[PDB]
Design an enzyme around this catalytic site. Structure first.
Site, short mmCIF file in Angstrom:
data_model
loop_
_atom_site.label_atom_id
_atom_site.label_comp_id
_atom_site.label_asym_id
_atom_site.label_seq_id
_atom_site.Cartn_x
_atom_site.Cartn_y
_atom_site.Cartn_z
N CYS A 76 0.83 -1.19 0.00
CA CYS A 76 0.00 0.00 0.00
C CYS A 76 0.88 1.25 0.00
O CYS A 76 2.07 1.18 0.31
CB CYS A 76 -0.92 0.00 1.22
N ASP A 79 2.89 1.26 3.26
CA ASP A 79 3.92 0.23 3.43
C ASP A 79 5.24 0.65 2.79
O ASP A 79 6.31 0.22 3.23
CB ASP A 79 3.44 -1.09 2.83
N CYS A 139 -5.28 -4.29 7.06
CA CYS A 139 -4.10 -3.83 7.79
C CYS A 139 -3.59 -2.50 7.24
O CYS A 139 -2.97 -1.72 7.96
CB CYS A 139 -2.99 -4.88 7.71
#
EC number: 4.99.1.2
Length: 192
Positions: A76, A79, A139
């Protein structure tokens, strides 16, 4: 007598760092270092059992994060990075619009950005849920959009999900930069 978390410092270097070196670097006994890893079993080791460092993903995503001279990957838009201000250098971030597929890229520096293309890209985030099964529960699910209209345009046809909200990479850095104070707290959060 201070400590600016040399662990990640030597880590950013992306070089084989053993305990005697982490110990030698921290000027601390190999046992103190040990104590640290003594509770870090999830950490990825390499070769004989040294600290591999970071990696995010095994290079197979769309979110790319270039820093100094090390190409990184992510699942993402988040990340890709974690703490640019902690690095002490610039971080080139590349993304692709989930709707237009346009090649978006931003430069994340320790103080701000220095390369926004296109000049007006938008970021996407999700709302916190507390009524879902156990596995991940989004997440991250952080994507980027070529712009606010596309972000909001594609967003229009991206409703129904667990909240999902759009934002300007400009405000995304303030919300991402504020998380520090939230994480800095050892426990509890008295304020609101």
């Amino acid at each position: 007598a201070d400590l600016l978390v040399p662990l990640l410092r030597e880590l950013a270097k992306g070089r084989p760092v053993s305990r005697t070196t982490l110990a030698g670097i921290l000027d601390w006994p190999a046992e103190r270092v040990a104590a640290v890893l003594e509770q870090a079993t999830s950490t990825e080791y390499d070769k004989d059992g040294n600290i591999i460092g970071y990696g995010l993903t095994l290079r197979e995503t769309s979110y790319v994060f270039e820093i100094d001279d090390r190409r990184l990957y992510a699942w993402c838009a988040l990340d890709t990075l974690i703490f640019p201000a902690l690095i002490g250098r610039t971080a080139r971030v590349s993304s692709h619009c989930a709707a237009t597929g346009a090649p978006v890229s931003l430069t994340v520096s320790p103080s701000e950005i220095q390369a926004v293309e296109p000049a007006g890209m938008a970021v996407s985030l999700v709302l916190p849920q507390e009524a879902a099964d156990v596995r991940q529960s989004f997440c991250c699910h952080v994507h980027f959009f070529a712009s606010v209209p596309t972000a909001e345009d594609w967003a229009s046809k991206h409703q129904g999900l667990e909240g999902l909200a759009i934002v300007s990479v400009h405000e995304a850095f303030g919300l991402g930069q504020e998380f520090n104070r939230h994480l800095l707290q050892t426990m509890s959060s008295r304020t609101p």
